[PDB]
Design a protein around this ligand. Structure first.
Ligand SMILES: CC(C)CCC[C@@H](C)[C@H]1CC[C@H]2[C@@H]3CC=C4C[C@@H](OC(=O)CCC(=O)O)CC[C@]4(C)[C@H]3CC[C@]12C
Ligand SMILES: CC(C)CCC[C@@H](C)[C@H]1CC[C@H]2[C@@H]3CC=C4C[C@@H](OC(=O)CCC(=O)O)CC[C@]4(C)[C@H]3CC[C@]12C
Ligand SMILES: *[C@@H]1O[C@H](CO)[C@@H](O)[C@H](O)[C@H]1NC(C)=O
Ligand SMILES: *[C@@H]1O[C@H](CO)[C@@H](O)[C@H](O)[C@H]1NC(C)=O
Ligand SMILES: *[C@@H]1O[C@H](CO)[C@@H](O)[C@H](O)[C@H]1NC(C)=O
Ligand SMILES: O=S(=O)(O)C1CCNCC1
Ligand SMILES: [Cl-]
Ligand code: NA
Length: 518
């Protein structure tokens, strides 16, 4: 009972949905976890095999169904709604740890207003005697001031997950503030996701261009470019690199999250030609490809400054951005204003992504039961309830020692086997039950043109093989998850993470057996 008011609002909403902290922070992190450029070889193959095809697929399904993401697949076939349920579970478990990064980002923002940058000096109440300045570091028991800051000021590092500590209040208050900024932005101005943002949309691109120019100008970038580009065929046999590359492809474009299907489902039949899908895919691929240039150039500068190997300069964990950016902005003149602008830009990206996902999930939940809900004051109950539940549940990652739970969430929840499972089932059903020929006939009149033979040999052959092979190789060749290559997780922690992944995985067989029973 709702549709877009402008033809450009849908495009802006979709665009804002996929550009953000996934292709500027996690992408360099995942490409840095595995040495060399071996990340790139599966990147392009998985892109042209599953990314753009599915990216068009749920869009066209949503526009044909004009209904919620949980029920869009229901319209296609009565079974396989486990895809939608797994998507909603994945997004619900993804928001929890996707807002904590914004929480400490805004903590950095508030801590950046000071006259002198806290991470540019060595003497603080949270610094060990093993504190040497990186400028004179080159002048095996020494670290850099930013490394000490990241692990002893923003969040104190407990010796392990087995020993949780005391709940920190600064990060909890910052994350509550983020939730308050997100709540008022939802129950007021629902159209603001694409209405007033027309002039602010160019701001992140301009800031990214400035960052790219500054990073390219920054010395010691040749090593970073070589590491980013040139591949390493030596270590392709283990499935770690393929798994992370495929999951990054499926992460940046937000496949299997039930968001793009709803965004396209807002529009009614006979929508414009979907060349915009291939346009937006190319736009996001280019943004991700160019951000890595600046990121790896600044990591190359850090490597040439500290004097250690490129693979060991950072923590190889989710703190890559917050250890790379400060070292780049400390030398570049006028640190304070540029730091403020940079962190507000990060908040903009994270926020837009956060409320888009929240809108999608809330739309799915309200479409699940429409009898009990109506557009009006009644939305307050189910917005406040979900916000409070998420705030309380995400309080276990801001405590000292909550970093480990965050890393477990990053590795298992909303990534890895669950995404491949859901995508493989989507392609399998759409190709071998409904039929690609039916979709071509349905879209011929809508588009006005017959697409080339590239949606039938990519929905039925290319994607299922690259999903099942990676899944089987991951099962056969197993390596326990490690943090910073040093810590060894307890067995019950690995069991908890595997249960986290299996909760999303098991959605499909459960609904299949339930529908088979009756
Ligand atoms: C932030 C946390 C709480 C998220 C946890 C995962 C949720 C996405 C799951 C957990 C329980 C699920 C619900 C469990 C039961 C139902 C009832 C079901 O329809 C029924 O009423 C029939 C079955 C019944 O009576 O429960 C529709 C899906 C729904 C709302 C599920 C929607 C998805 C939910 C909320
Ligand atoms: C329990 C642990 C191991 C996993 C974490 C919980 C959720 C990830 C899963 C587990 C069982 C799932 C439920 C199993 C069965 C159903 C019924 C099915 O809904 C219906 O078809 C409603 C009835 C109907 O319309 O016929 C799909 C949603 C739901 C509530 C599922 C929602 C998601 C749940 C709660
Ligand atoms: C660190 O050095 C500064 C300047 O040398 C000094 O003022 C300060 O007391 C020292 N200790 C701490 C904890 O800052
Ligand atoms: C070692 O000391 C100075 C002190 O700032 C440092 O900047 C420089 O790298 C070194 N000086 C030399 C090698 O003359
Ligand atoms: C310095 O590094 C050595 C490594 O051989 C280590 O044994 C020592 O504990 C470290 N610290 C000091 C103060 O020597
Ligand atoms: O790539 S992002 O836009 O930042 C985000 C989008 C939603 N799925 C996780 C990544
Ligand atoms: Cl990407
Ligand atoms: Na975004």
């Amino acid at each position: 009972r709702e549709k877009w008011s402008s033809k450009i609002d849908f495009v802006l909403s979709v665009a804002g949905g996929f550009v953000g902290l996934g292709n500027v922070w996690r992408f360099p992190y995942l490409c840095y976890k595995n040495g060399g450029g071996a990340f790139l070889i599966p990147y392009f193959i998985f892109l042209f095999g599953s990314g753009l095809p599915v990216f068009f697929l749920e869009i066209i399904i949503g526009q044909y169904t004009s209904e919620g993401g949980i029920t869009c697949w229901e319209k296609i076939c009565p079974l396989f709604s486990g895809i939608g349920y797994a998507s909603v579970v994945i997004v619900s478990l993804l928001n929890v740890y996707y807002i904590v990064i914004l929480a400490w980002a805004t903590y950095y923002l508030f801590q950046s207003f000071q006259k002198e940058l806290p991470w540019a000096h060595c003497n603080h109440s949270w610094n060990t005697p093993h504190c040497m300045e990186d400028t004179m570091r080159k002048n095996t028991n020494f670290t850099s001031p930013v490394i000490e800051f990241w692990e002893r000021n923003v969040l104190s590092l407990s010796p392990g997950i087995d020993h949780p500590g005391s709940l920190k209040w600064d990060l909890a208050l910052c994350l509550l503030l983020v939730w308050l900024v997100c709540f008022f932005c939802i129950w007021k101005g629902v159209r603001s996701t694409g209405k007033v943002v027309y002039f602010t949309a160019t701001f992140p691109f301009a800031m990214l261009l400035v960052l790219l120019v500054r990073g390219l100008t920054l010395p010691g970038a040749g090593a970073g470019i070589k590491f980013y580009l040139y591949p390493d065929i030596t270590r392709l046999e283990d499935p770690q690199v393929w798994i992370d590359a495929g999951t990054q492809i499926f992460f940046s474009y937000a496949i299997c999250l039930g968001a793009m299907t709803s965004l396209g489902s807002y529009n009614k039949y006979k929508y414009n030609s979907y060349r915009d899908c291939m346009l937006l895919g190319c736009l996001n691929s280019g943004t991700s490809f160019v951000s890595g240039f600046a990121i790896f150039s600044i990591l190359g500068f850090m490597a040439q400054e500290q004097g250690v190997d490129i693979a060991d300069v950072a923590e190889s964990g989710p703190g890559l951005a917050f250890i790379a950016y400060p070292k780049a902005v400390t030398m570049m003149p006028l640190p304070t204003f540029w730091s403020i602008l940079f962190f507000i830009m990060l908040l903009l990206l994270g926020l837009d992504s956060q409320f888009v996902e929240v809108e999608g999930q809330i739309t799915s939940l309200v479409d699940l039961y429409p009898s009990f809900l109506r557009k009006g004051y009644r939305r307050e109950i189910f917005i406040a309830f979900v916000c409070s539940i998420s705030y309380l549940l995400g309080l276990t990652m801001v405590t000292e020692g909550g970093m480990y739970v965050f890393q477990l969430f990053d590795y298992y929840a909303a990534s890895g086997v669950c995404l491949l499972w859901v995508a493989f089932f989507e392609c399998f059903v759409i190709a071998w039950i409904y039929g690609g020929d039916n979709l071509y006939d349905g879209i011929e009149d809508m588009i006005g043109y017959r697409p080339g033979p590239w949606m039938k040999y990519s929905w039925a052959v290319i994607t299922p093989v690259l999903c099942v092979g990676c899944f089987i190789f991951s099962l056969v060749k197993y390596v326990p998850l490690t943090y910073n290559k040093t810590y060894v997780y307890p067995n019950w922690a690995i069991g908890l993470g595997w249960s986290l992944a299996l909760s999303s995985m098991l959605c499909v067989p459960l609904v299949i057996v339930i529908r088979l029973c009756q």
